[PDB]
């Protein structure tokens, strides 16, 4: 319970599975440099929920960008360097609080999300 996602949950009220066209779907962080803005989404084990983790961190830190696994969908920004994002790591709820999902400006809004 010492490890968590930096971002809030994305509850899925609809029946349609979550999807994102290329580029969109990456929450924005002012602390993050344009190189660091690269990671994945993991479906919450136990409605389904999705958590964003940076590349090389989180429950699937060992997966390289582009792997196929059910529950894992990959997103990345432009100019994002392919490195382990160890300098961001994950979130400790004891020392830091969860950050509201920071969607980019005028992004896609699939069914069920307002």
């Amino acid at each position: 319970n010492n490890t968590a996602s930096w971002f809030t949950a994305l509850t899925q009220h609809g029946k349609e599975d979550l999807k994102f066209p290329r580029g969109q779907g990456v929450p924005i962080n002012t602390n993050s440099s344009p190189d660091d803005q690269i990671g994945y989404y993991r479906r919450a084990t136990r409605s389904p929920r999705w958590y964003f983790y940076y590349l090389g961190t989180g429950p699937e830190a060992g997966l390289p960008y582009g792997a196929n696994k059910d529950g894992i969908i990959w997103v990345a920004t432009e100019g994002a360097l392919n490195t382990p994002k160890d300098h961001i790591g994950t979130r400790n709820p004891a020392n830091n609080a969860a950050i509201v999902l920071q969607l980019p400006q005028g992004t896609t809004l699939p069914k069920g999300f307002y």
């Epitope: 582009g66 792997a67 196929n68 990959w74």
Partner: T-cell receptor, first 110, second 109 residues
């Protein structure tokens, strides 16, 4: 648009070698591959090369007699196939690609 | 590894058909780098699909890609006689290589 020219047709005898070229009309971090196709048969991938790095990966079926090399200064890449035999009669292609691997991203939509 | 493809494919022109491309867990169902190529008889291969679904610019939306399990499927819609050519699938491997399919030749009635 970037197009590729090669070395002309060749007619060699078994036991000798062959060195084909592949010139591009970007030779930075470019995955250059050579593919084969026996007449009436399917495609068969053979090798890869990143020129500025020099690391070349080969398919295990061809690992041992084919060799891929790059000339980054001239923007040309060579391929050296030795120990030629009858079953190696086929049409040989070259192609330029891109691979992310451990480099920086570009919205170039590579 | 090995990539299994249907040898031949055909249908009434103007219609659509799904062409399969099967492999193992570490070449098609492990990575998202499945590709598709067209090769006219006598002409060099040409690209229509680079990522599993992504289509390069200058290619009509009549071509679209998809993947299920370890079996990707190419779906040509509104097939014309101008598409008469070979169709091959390729994908990245955990061995950091490329593997092609056995080949699917086409014919329009």
């Amino acid at each position: 648009q970037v197009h590729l020219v090669q070395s002309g047709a060749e007619v060699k005898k078994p036991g000798s070698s062959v060195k084909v070229s592949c010139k591009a009309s970007t030779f930075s971090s470019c995955a250059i591959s050579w593919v084969r196709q026996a007449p009436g048969q399917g495609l068969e991938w053979m090798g890869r090369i990143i020129p500025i790095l020099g690391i070349a990966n080969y398919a295990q079926k061809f690992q041992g007699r084919v060799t891929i090399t790059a000339d980054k200064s001239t923007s040309t890449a060579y391929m050296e196939l030795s120990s030629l035999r009858s079953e190696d009669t086929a049409v040989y292609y070259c192609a330029r690609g891109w691979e992310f691997g451990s480099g920086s991203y570009y919205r170039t939509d590579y | 590894s090995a990539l299994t493809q249907p040898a031949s494919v055909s249908g009434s022109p103007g219609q659509s058909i799904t062409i399969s491309c099967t492999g193992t867990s570490s070449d098609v169902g492990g990575y998202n780098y499945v590709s598709w190529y067209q090769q006219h008889p006598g002409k060099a291969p040409k690209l229509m699909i680079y990522e599993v679904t992504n289509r390069p610019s200058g290619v009509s939306n009549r071509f679209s890609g998809s993947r299920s399990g370890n079996t990707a499927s190419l779906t040509i819609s509104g097939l014309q006689a101008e598409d008469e050519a070979d169709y091959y699938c390729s994908s990245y491997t955990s061995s950091s290589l490329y593997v092609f399919g056995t080949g699917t030749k086409v014919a329009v009635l």
